[PDB]
DNA sequence: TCAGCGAGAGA
RNA sequence: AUCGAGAGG
DNA sequence: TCTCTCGCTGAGCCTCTCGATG
């Protein structure tokens, strides 16, 4: 089985996970540990933003790869926003301190 | 666009500020039709348009009028994404308590008050919490703290001081945080956004529903039932009971199951609350933020490819054509073969010949990453150059298997594609297989031939007597090759050949020497692949596994890296080529049974009989014949095994010339065992000797052994006996993997933030190194323990006023040989445990890099490396013992505490290191002591204050060691008196939860209490560790990102 | 640039900064439209940059002065 | 289920 | 899209 | 001060298949 692009889950807009559903492979915690022990920061940042639940970054990255420019500008994942909204739902104030 | 995350308690005004809609009285979405009903949980007005740029009534549908609310229906036009952003609120009619601040072992909603938990619960259960709300409102914190401070001094009992300090700390923290009282009791409730709790359609008309929408509706109806009752002025008897029914309802939306009798739904399973969506293996932290599913990936079965070079792998073309789609689209657009995306997609789908050349050019110099699932160390992911093949399986290099722990009996593998220039360069420069030849856990090579290669090279270099072609004199290796390929000579003939070899002259210049040497044909043939610079004596013998490893290491040391990979590939080709030509096989007559066996057993059966006679008339204890019979059987088994090996090792007798002689035999099993390719001595014992003595399931020794082997088979009773051990081994393997995994995760969590940040800290302390001698046999010498360290002080020669060793020197192989030429003493070291660096370690206190050979660089994540290096052999052992090391690393009480208190950090360091190495060495596992020292340094990061001094303190004041040291250093130049502190020791699980960062502590485990303390303290997170930046999605402050972060602090 | 990169590591000093310099130099050729300093030989920008670094013609302080020259002219 | 460690008991 | 049952490395 | 009940906490990783009930 293999995949390049496809469909994403509804709440956490990450790829689905079955061959019958045309899903992607899972990059777990131990693989993150291995990349950290290598020191490959840009590969990890690719693995967490552009190939995952970041929405504008993957679109811009696809257009750039089509145009021949191998460069990414990442953003914030949606799962963090979901976690923040749930924490707010529990009656607790949590904030990103811009200052 | 941000640098910190702040957490604090919420207020009714903040909750109403977060909201877009009023109190939601309606209960249901609307089941009849798609349009939701107003004012309820799902609502078009509150949370925004259901469809992009279209109002619910449909009066406005298109852009230029955007930003204008419709008049007739009052609907704003906006993108539907806002439906996963906005929130709402429920305005209650009666106040309700928050279960989190009440339900805990240190209950903090009644910690400020003096009421016990039982009494507070009884008042709250009414057998609505206006009493609690008013009591918290009326309390004055400043006067209470002033009274408690005076009361603390008067008290002379240690037990009384324990509670007073806890109360004072909580009061002071609550005052300084800024959170007002009476906020732990709710008056408004927030509502989660709609699109994060959606309703999913089904094949039939019915829709799947979420648990949250049920609990919310239950709370809404139970709270709204009190709304109408207020106007009717019902008797207080009915009023009180409903209030309690409200309480539990709220305790349903919040953490469920914390007070017993968890609510359930249609099935017989409890419903999952909001607290269930944040913790556990299925929560957000451990399932969606520290790991996720990715694009540009694939999976398949793996097969061996024997023709590849070490930096290549074989990739199927059907997978590749789909993995690299956008690059093909772009290159198709570049050459004019298409004019649109749809045309290119159709052209790729209806595959032509032109697209295959495009695929050939896209992947010409593009690496890929391969990964095997269990992923125990960092070598479980590597990078390769892909070669397009036919079929469906993946081809893998034989030399990388042992690092992957892979064999070709059904294993699968995953593949990923880098996309940016930085990622491609990192893959080429850091993760390429040609870069990884030395272990990070020790200093041993990770590529090593085995099995058929070893057997082929061993057979190629053996020696016989009176073989064909013996006695010739040759001009060189080419004449030997010609004679062997013609058919005029044997590989095992003893001859004289003229050989030339090169050596280092004085500065790396190769100088040649030529002579005559007695050797064999095969050795001279093999000499043609050895690189220039190595002596001839390294192949003039029978080459086993260890000899081949030694050859590879010598070539790496003398000549470097580039010749080494070529030498390895040539060795693999030669071994595979010459294993096939021998026709080595296995047959039933290879397993030879000694002739005297039938004697040794029989006489033994006599002796066991004789002691039985001694049991007829009382002469020996009935508990003594057991031992004597067991000893007799052990001696008999030893005799039989010795006879078998003595017959098998010299089984060949040879007629040299009219005379007989003995030589090493050519029996297949014996050569397979001797060369080191497959098979230990005990397995040969079982195959052709005696099976031995078994054990009962309890652990006792069964008196009668198995006198048969696997050649002459077993009967029913012996076979039945031998099943207990097999089942016990399989059960032990099946159930102890989880313990190793849990220990590894704990070790990774305790040390994930340690990074090399400087070069020299300036300290002068250290650890004295001495050889480990116990009982009389030196278990550990005094050479390997100090290889690669840095001397803390000057080392003196065995004489007055003599300095044997220069300071700050880095000991390498040549230096080690020079030292061992006249070694008379030992060397002190600097340890990472004794390092004055703040927030990290310095290079000279660490040492050299085991993977590379030189001094450790800046930006290394040595903590993760230590954690993997320790956790890998424990897991690999699975598929005293593990409980012993888990008991040490958790600081379990039987003591290390007294060791630290009485002899410093050296005592605990020595105790833990020695007691871990004792367990690990019994299994023959090699791990350097640096990693254990890293973990121990992480195990002690807290100090207990005693004397306040001139700085701020709170008597006990368990604080960070680094912060106390910083305060003492700051209050030194100005002139003052510092504080007094003692060092504490903690277990890894306890040490992980007491960290300055609450995000990582919440990520580890026990989310609820960590979040409770953080919310009541008003903590602030600075995003300094690896895990925090992983969770937020930024470059980690290590490796290729390190400089980036150093730029950031230079911008402020 | 091919099979092994050890020479460029020795010429720059460590792998982490070598990656950054190589990426910065490769982006100039790929996107900014700049000519190579070696025969191209049907190679990608990454390996071309690695070869130029191994030859000694490219390092960080060279890419500083070269860019400073362009700013003055413009 | 089974350890592990507080927390709250008392003679 | 969970809940039970098995299977592979 | 020194035993004795009383309790929430935690328990390896990645794939595949079926049915029943939403
Ligand atoms: C059952 N299981 C198996 C594995 C993985 O499977 C590998 C061996 O599985 P295997 O089929 O190749 O058999 P093995 O090589 O040991 O012996 P034979 O080839 O028969 O001689 C083993 O390394 C291990 O990582 C795991 N991580 N968890 C499990 O629960
Ligand atoms: Mg296998
Ligand atoms: Zn409208
Ligand atoms: Zn230091």
């Amino acid at each position: 089985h293999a995949r390049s692009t496809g469909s994403y889950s509804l709440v956490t807009q990450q790829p689905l996970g079955g061959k019958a559903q045309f899903g992607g492979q899972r990059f777990g915690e131990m693989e993150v540990w291995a990349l950290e022990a290598y020191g490959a920061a840009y590969t990890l940042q690719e693995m967490l933003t552009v190939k995952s639940d970041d929405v504008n970054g993957r679109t811009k990255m696809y257009k750039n790869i089509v145009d021949g420019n191998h460069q990414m500008e990442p953003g914030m994942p949606e799962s963090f926003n979901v976690l923040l909204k749930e924490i707010r739902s529990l009656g607790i104030n949590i904030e990103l301190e811009d200052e | 666009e941000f640098d910190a995350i702040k957490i604090a308690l919420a207020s009714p005004d903040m909750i109403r500020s977060w909201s877009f809609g009023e109190v939601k009285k309606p209960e249901t979405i609307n089941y009849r039709t798609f349009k939701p009903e107003r004012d309820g949980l799902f609502c078009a007005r509150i949370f925004g348009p259901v469809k992009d740029y279209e109002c619910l009534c449909g009066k406005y549908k298109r852009l230029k009028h955007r930003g204008v609310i419709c008049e007739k229906c009052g609907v704003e036009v906006t993108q539907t994404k806002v439906r996963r952003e906005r929130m709402g609120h429920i305005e209650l009619a009666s106040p309700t308590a928050h279960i989190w601040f009440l339900k805990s072992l240190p209950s903090r909603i009644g910690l400020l008050l003096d009421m016990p938990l039982r009494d507070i619960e009884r008042v709250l259960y009414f057998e609505g919490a206006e009493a609690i709300q008013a009591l918290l409102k009326s309390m004055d914190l400043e006067q209470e703290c002033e009274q408690l401070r005076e009361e603390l001094n008067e008290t002379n009992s240690e037990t009384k001081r324990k509670k007073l300090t806890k109360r004072i700390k909580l009061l002071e923290a609550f005052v300084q945080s800024g959170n007002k009282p009476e906020w732990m009791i709710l008056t408004v409730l927030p509502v989660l956004p709609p699109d994060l709790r959606p309703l999913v359609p089904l094949d039939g008309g019915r829709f799947a529903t979420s648990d949250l929408n049920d609990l919310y509706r239950r709370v809404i109806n139970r709270n709204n039932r009190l709304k109408r009752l207020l106007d009717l002025a019902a008797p207080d008897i009915i009023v009180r009971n409903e209030k309690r029914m409200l309480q539990e309802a709220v305790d349903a939306l919040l953490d469920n199951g914390r007070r017993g009798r968890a609510i359930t739904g249609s099935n017989k399973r409890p419903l999952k609350s909001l607290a269930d969506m944040i913790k556990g293996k299925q929560g957000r932290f451990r399932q969606n933020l520290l790991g996720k599913r990715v694009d540009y990936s694939g999976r398949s079965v793996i097969t061996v490819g024997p023709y590849l070079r070490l930096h290549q792998c074989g990739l199927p073309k059907k997978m590749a054509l789909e993995l690299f789609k956008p690059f093909i689209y772009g290159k198709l657009e570049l050459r004019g073969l298409a004019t649109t995306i749809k045309a290119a997609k159709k052209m790729v789908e209806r595959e032509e010949a032109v697209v295959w050349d495009i695929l050939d050019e896209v992947i010409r110099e593009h690496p890929v990453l391969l990964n095997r699932a269990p992923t125990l160390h960092r070598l479980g992911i590597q990078a390769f150059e892909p070669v397009l093949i036919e079929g469906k399986a993946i081809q893998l290099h034989p030399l990388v298997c042992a690092a992957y722990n892979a064999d070709f009996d059904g294993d699968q593998m995953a593949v990923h594609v880098p996309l940016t220039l930085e990622a491609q360069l990192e893959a080429r420069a850091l993760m390429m297989s040609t870069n990884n030849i030395l272990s990070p856990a020790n200093g041993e090579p990770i590529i090593v031939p085995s099995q058929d290669v070893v057997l082929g090279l061993y057979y190629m270099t053996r020696d016989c007597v009176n073989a064909k072609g013996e006695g010739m004199v040759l001009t060189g290796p080419k004449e030997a090759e010609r004679l062997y390929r013609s058919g005029l000579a044997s590989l095992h003939a003893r001859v004289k050949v003229r050989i030339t070899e090169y050596e280092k002259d004085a500065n790396g210049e190769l100088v040649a020497k030529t002579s005559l040497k007695d050797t064999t044909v095969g050795r001279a043939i093999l000499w043609m692949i050895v690189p220039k610079g190595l002596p001839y004596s390294i192949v003039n013998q029978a080459l086993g596994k260890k000899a081949i490893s030694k050859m590879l290491n010598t070539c790496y040391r003398i000549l470097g890296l580039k010749p080494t990979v070529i030498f390895a590939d040539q060795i693999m080709y030669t071994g595979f080529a010459y294993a096939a030509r021998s026709g080595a096989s296995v047959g039933i007559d290879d397993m030879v049974i000694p002739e005297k066996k039938h004697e040794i057993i029989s006489e033994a059966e006599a002796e066991v009989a004789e002691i039985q006679e001694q049991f007829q008339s009382g002469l020996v204890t009935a508990g003594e014949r057991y031992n004597k019979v067991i000893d007799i059987w052990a001696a008999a088994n030893d005799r039989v095994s010795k006879a078998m090996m003595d017959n098998l090792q010299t089984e060949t007798v040879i007629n040299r010339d009219g005379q007989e002689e003995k030589q090493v035999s050519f029996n297949s099993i014996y050569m397979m065992a001797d060369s080191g390719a497959r098979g230990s001595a005990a397995q040969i014992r079982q195959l052709a000797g005696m099976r031995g003595l078994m054990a009962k399931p309890d652990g006792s020794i069964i008196e009668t052994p198995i006198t048969a082997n696997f050649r002459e088979g077993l009967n029913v009773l012996q076979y039945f006996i031998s099943t207990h051990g097999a089942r016990k081994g399989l059960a032990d393997t099946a159930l102890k993997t989880a313990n190793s995994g849990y220990l590894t995760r704990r070790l990774v969590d305790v040390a994930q933030d340690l990074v090399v940040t400087e070069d020299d800290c300036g300290t002068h302390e250290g650890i004295m190194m001495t050889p480990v001698i116990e009982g009389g046999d030196v278990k550990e010498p005094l050479r390997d323990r100090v290889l690669g360290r840095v001397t803390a002080e000057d080392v003196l020669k065995p004489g007055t006023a003599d300095i044997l060793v220069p300071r700050n020197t880095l000991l390498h192989e040549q230096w080690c040989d020079l030292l061992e030429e006249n070694s008379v003493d030992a060397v002190k070291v600097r340890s990472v445990v004794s390092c004055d660096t703040d927030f990290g370690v310095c290079a000279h206190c660490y040492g050299r890099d085991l993977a590379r050979g030189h001094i450790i660089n800046k930006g290394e994540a040595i903590g993760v490396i230590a954690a993997q290096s320790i956790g890998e052999p424990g897991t690999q052992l699975t598929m005293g013992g593990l409980p012993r090391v888990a008991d040490l690393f958790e600081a379990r009480r039987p003591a290390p505490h007294d060791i630290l208190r009485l002899r410093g950090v050296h005592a605990v360091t020595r105790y833990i290191v020695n007691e871990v190495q004792d367990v690990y060495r019994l299994q023959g596992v090699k791990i350097n002591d640096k990693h254990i020292e890293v973990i121990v340094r992480q195990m002690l990061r807290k100090a207990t204050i005693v004397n306040a001094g001139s700085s701020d303190f709170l008597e006990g004041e368990q604080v960070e060691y680094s912060r106390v040291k910083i305060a003492n250093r700051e209050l030194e130049a100005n002139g003052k008196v510092g504080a007094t502190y003692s060092r504490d020791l903690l277990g890894i699980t306890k040490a992980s939860l007491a960290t300055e960062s609450f995000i990582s502590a919440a990520s580890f485990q026990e989310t609820t209490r960590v979040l409770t303390e953080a919310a009541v303290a008003g903590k602030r997170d600075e995003l300094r560790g690896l895990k925090e930046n992983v969770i937020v999605g930024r470059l980690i402050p290590a490796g290729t990102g390190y400089a980036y972060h150093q730029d950031r602090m230079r911008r402020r | 640039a091919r099979v092994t990169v050890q020479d460029a590591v020795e010429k720059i000093g460590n792998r982490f900064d070598l990656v950054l310099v190589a990426a910065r130099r490769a982006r100039q050729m790929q996107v900014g439209g700049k000519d190579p300093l070696v025969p191209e030989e049907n190679d990608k920008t990454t390996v071309i940059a690695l070869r130029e670094i191994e030859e000694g013609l490219i390092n960080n302080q060279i890419l500083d002065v070269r860019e400073r020259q362009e700013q003055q002219e413009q």
Side-chain angles (χ1 to χ4, degrees), chain A residues 12-24:
Chain A
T12 75
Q13 303 204 40
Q14 308 193 351
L16 305 152
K19 190 201 156 151
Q21 292 192 235
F22 209 71

Side-chain angles (χ1 to χ4, degrees), chain B residues 319-334:
Chain B
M319 282 172 77
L321 179 56
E322 202 266 329
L323 282 176
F324 288 84
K325 264 198 193 168
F327 307 88
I328 290 144
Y329 290 163
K331 278 188 152 20
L332 270 176
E333 262 284 346
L334 172 58

Side-chain angles (χ1 to χ4, degrees), chain B residues 44 66-67 74 96 99 330 367 396 438 461 478 559 622 729 816 915:
Chain B
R66 100 178 184 272
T96 309
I99 185 64
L396 193 81
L438 282 177
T461 45
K478 283 204 281 323
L559 293 175
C816 279
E915 285 318 277

Side-chain angles (χ1 to χ4, degrees), chain B residues 611-612 615 620-623 625-630 703:
Chain B
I611 195 170
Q612 289 292 92
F615 192 76
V620 72
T621 306
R625 43 158 301 283
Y626 184 74
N627 279 319
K628 300 195 95 168
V629 169
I630 282 181
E703 281 176 40

Side-chain angles (χ1 to χ4, degrees), chain B residues 407-411:
Chain B
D407 55 23
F408 310 101
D409 51 45
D411 292 332

Side-chain angles (χ1 to χ4, degrees), chain B residues 427-451 453-504 506 508 510-545 547-549 551-573:
Chain B
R428 199 173 279 274
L430 307 172
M431 300 181 269
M432 215 70 187
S433 80
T434 43
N435 293 319
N436 319 316
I437 65 163
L438 282 177
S439 168
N442 43 56
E444 321 306 300
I446 75 182
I447 68 174
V448 64
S450 52
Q451 312 205 282
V453 177
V454 170
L455 172 77
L457 284 198
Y458 170 82
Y459 180 75
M460 183 177 177
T461 45
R462 274 280 304 252
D463 161 33
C464 191
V465 170
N466 208 1
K468 181 176 82 164
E470 181 200 42
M472 307 200 186
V473 190
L474 313 188
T475 46
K478 283 204 281 323
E479 192 160 9
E481 183 178 1
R482 210 150 68 239
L483 283 178
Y484 170 73
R485 283 312 276 256
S486 285
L488 267 293
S490 164
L491 282 182
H492 306 133
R494 298 182 291 219
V495 288
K496 297 181 180 67
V497 188
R498 179 197 263 151
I499 301 284
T500 181
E501 42 185 325
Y502 300 84
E503 203 154 2
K504 300 287 95 175
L510 294 173
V511 63
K513 169 204 57 184
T514 289
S515 65
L516 263 181
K517 304 224 210 193
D518 306 343
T519 186
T520 71
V521 171
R523 287 157 203 180
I525 292 190
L526 177 74
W527 172 249
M528 301 195 258
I529 62 147
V530 186
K532 267 185 204 61
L534 276 64
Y536 191 67
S537 61
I538 199 166
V539 301
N540 212 28
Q541 54 176 349
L543 287 172
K545 203 185 160 62
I548 295 167
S549 296
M551 271 196 318
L552 269 185
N553 207 60
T554 301
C555 171
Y556 180 68
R557 292 325 163 171
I558 289 190
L559 293 175
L561 176 74
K562 278 211 300 283
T564 300
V565 301
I566 295 153
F567 195 24
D569 263 357
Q570 292 314 298
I571 281 168
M572 185 174 95
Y573 299 152

